[PDB]
Amino acid sequence: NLAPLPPHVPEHLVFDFDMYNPSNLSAGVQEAWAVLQESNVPDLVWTRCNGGHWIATRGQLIREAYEDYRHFSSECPFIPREAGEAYDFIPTSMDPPEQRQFRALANQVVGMPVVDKLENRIQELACSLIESLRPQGQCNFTEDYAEPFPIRIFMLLAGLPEEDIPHLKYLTDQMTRPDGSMTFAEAKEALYDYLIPIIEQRRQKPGTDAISIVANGQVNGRPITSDEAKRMCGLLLVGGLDTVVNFLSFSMEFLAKSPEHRQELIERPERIPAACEELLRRFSLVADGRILTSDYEFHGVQLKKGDQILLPQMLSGLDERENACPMHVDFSRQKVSHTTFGHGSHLCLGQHLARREIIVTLKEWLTRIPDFSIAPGAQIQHKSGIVSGVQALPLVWDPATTKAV
């Protein structure tokens, strides 16, 4: 299902890549996207898939475009166009300087200070979940840890009942990895209908939870509106429910296949932070974009106003020009270059929370379950979209090789 090639786009720049169903997905989602970095592919190409849009394939261009919000606006940051136009989350649908004050408020509820304060609960939950699974000798990692660990921490931060997780997780996933069951707008609206009642309650009887803080915050020297709080909380729900949740599975899948890397972190724990960064590079998973504010010649390519351009955060770190032997995991890389958490004015505010959750998981999991692997004959499948993920990850291990703390 390709859209007619626009007049201004040269045929030699055409490369029909589908970000929601890459042809080489069976080899791994990152590998599937890396086909865009083969020698036969230009640095900047146009795909006729998903309505038609540009795709920057090199880290240099991706970074450049994310810095130049003047030409590349966040007003319509998602592909397809229908999703990008319906998307109105704050601050991700705003350009500087309008995003400034909202970004500051969001930083108040998920910033480093909050993460350091919540570290004890994060550690507590990781240890509890892992210790419960340890003597079982098996688990379905996605539903047994990848999901409950980051999600319960977020629901605690936001003061939301855990009973609502199933409902919320379904909706956030419809936005990032569309099922065709409902439009982007419908999923977004459902999320808003859930928040509206809560925000109204929190504005009346304020609490100390993340939603209360956002709902009663100040922006531009004045009170934040019910609508703006809703648009901010919508983004927080996606960050809490569909980011780290997916990344942990890519990382655990790799570790299950690499005894050498597991042993490495076990005897050299101080390398965990660096391992976290290298895994964030190798298993990068986000891909959003921008919209051209006007006609513009970018690196010899003529872009037209209204054109959408995908700037895959995932691709920068896999670019061989940024990291030699990009598909190889090396915890000792002199410089782990990547844009996994974004680049520019919208650099992820939850990156500190994400790193803390990843580092705690690596340390606590390897301590109790140092030796494990993917279930026999199990064929792991990945899924692609705005945020990519792992369908299922069955792991197995000899309980006799585990350690209780």
Ligand code: HEM
């Ligand atoms: C491994 C996990 C994560 C990854 C890879 C990630 C990635 C990103 C990226 C690439 C952006 C920028 C998008 C753009 O430029 O349009 C972003 C923005 C953002 N992220 Fe995350 N994120 C993660 C986890 C989280 C978590 C756990 C939270 C909080 C609950 C969070 C909150 C935010 C917020 C609030 C923004 C908007 C910043 C702004 O617009 O100024 N993220 N994230």
